[PDB]
């Protein structure tokens, strides 16, 4: 038979090619790294305080359907925005997997491994922007200044991207309020041993990921680690 462009009737080459198997190995390391980064959260037999979905019975299932629509929007990116997502997650994982050449070797091949590590290593030493509650309005206005610059690529030319968007359906965005309002309280009502492990790891996170030998950026991070945990990668438009 000849190709499907002339005088055929069904789509062919339904076979596991090289690029599908390359996507298949990379999805499986994504289910291993996210397994291993959840091991620090659930380290004993019980689920921790921050592995929670929601509070309302309709809101716990709305966390998945938002996140299932969130992972479609990373797939729905443009070809320039996919390639800038490709190499920037390569760069932020060598800073993550620092001292090993073997751990540096694996991320340069597998591309969804790079998104899996630097999202989970942010949530292993809890340097996320959700898990930190600043102790005062001195640290809060330092934390509220930096993330608005991190929101400045949600609109790159004054028009919004899809990556900053949180409403996907009718009445969707109100669950996205109360899931983070409860996450702000549970971070505030976390244990006293964990929150000072948060500030020291986040001020160690910002000095190696964004300062790079700068005395001024290390000094504000050691004064305000809440602003250090709001600092993220620029591949995330939000």
């Amino acid at each position: 038979q000849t190709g499907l462009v002339n005088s055929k009737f069904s789509a062919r080459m339904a076979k596991k090619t090289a690029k599908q198997t390359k996507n298949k190995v990379d999805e499986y390391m994504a289910r291993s790294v996210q397994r291993q980064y959840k091991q620090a959260a659930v380290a004993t037999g019980v689920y921790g305080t921050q592995c929670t979905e929601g509070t309302v019975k309709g809101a716990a299932e709305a966390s998945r359907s938002a996140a299932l629509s969130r992972q479609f929007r990373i797939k729905q990116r443009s070809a320039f925005s996919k390639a800038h997502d490709l190499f920037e997650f390569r760069k932020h994982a060598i800073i993550a997997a620092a001292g090993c050449s073997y751990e540096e070797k694996m991320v340069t091949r597998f591309p969804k491994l790079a998104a899996a590590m630097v999202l989970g290593q942010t949530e292993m030493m809890r340097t996320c922007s959700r898990y930190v509650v600043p102790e005062s309005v001195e640290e809060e206005y330092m934390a509220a200044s930096v993330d608005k610059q991190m929101k400045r690529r949600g609109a790159p030319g004054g028009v919004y991207s899809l990556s900053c968007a949180e409403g996907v359906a009718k009445g969707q965005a109100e669950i996205a309020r109360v899931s983070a309002l409860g996450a702000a309280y549970r971070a505030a009502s976390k244990s006293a041993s964990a929150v000072t492990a948060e500030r020291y790891n986040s001020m160690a996170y910002g000095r190696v990921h964004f300062a790079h030998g700068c005395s001024y950026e290390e000094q504000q991070f050691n004064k305000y680690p809440a602003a250090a945990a709001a600092m993220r990668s620029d591949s995330y438009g939000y």
């Binding site: 609109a155 790159p156 004054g158 028009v159 919004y160 409403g167 009718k170």
Partner: protein, 164 residues
């Protein structure tokens, strides 16, 4: 592509809403003010070759040191590529008159411009000289209408707010 239609539907798509009555009303603003900026569009389009020669030589009228050897106007083809860029900026201000906003400047003339002129050793103070010579050369009821000169020149001094 910052425009009237584009920034109002991306805010609706950020929250996932339909275009509500706040969103149809912004396009109603693109009938009254869209008569003035589109009337200045073919005024610039019909007379563009007389602009970039007669307002393009004001770069080397004030900044006469660029012709000298060493700097950016040292020969003919770097002088010829200088008149091409003010003609590039005259298209992108003519393209901003028809999108109703700051669209084709912010993607094709502004973003990344402040790193190109550094590494190519092009003085941006010479770029704002030939633009501000077009900014004050405005006899208001003779180029265009009385309000068409406001919306045309609003993108000119926005560019001087961007290049400087």
């Amino acid at each position: 592509m910052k425009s009237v239609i584009t920034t109002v539907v991306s805010a609706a798509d950020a929250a996932g809403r339909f275009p509500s009555n706040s969103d149809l009303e912004s396009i109603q603003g693109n009938i009254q003010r869209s008569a003035a900026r589109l009337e200045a569009a073919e005024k610039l389009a019909g007379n563009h070759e007389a602009v970039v020669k007669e307002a393009g030589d004001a770069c080397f009228a004030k900044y006469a040191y660029l012709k000298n050897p060493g700097e950016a106007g040292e020969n003919q083809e770097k002088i010829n590529k200088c008149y091409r860029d003010v003609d590039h900026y005259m298209r992108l201000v003519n393209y901003c008159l028809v999108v109703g906003g700051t669209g084709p400047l912010d993607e094709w003339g502004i973003a990344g411009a402040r790193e190109v002129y550094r590494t190519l050793n092009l003085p941006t103070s010479a770029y704002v000289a030939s633009i501000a010579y077009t900014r004050d050369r405005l006899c208001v009821p003779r180029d265009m209408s009385a309000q068409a000169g406001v919306e045309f020149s609003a993108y000119l001094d926005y560019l001087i707010n961007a290049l400087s």
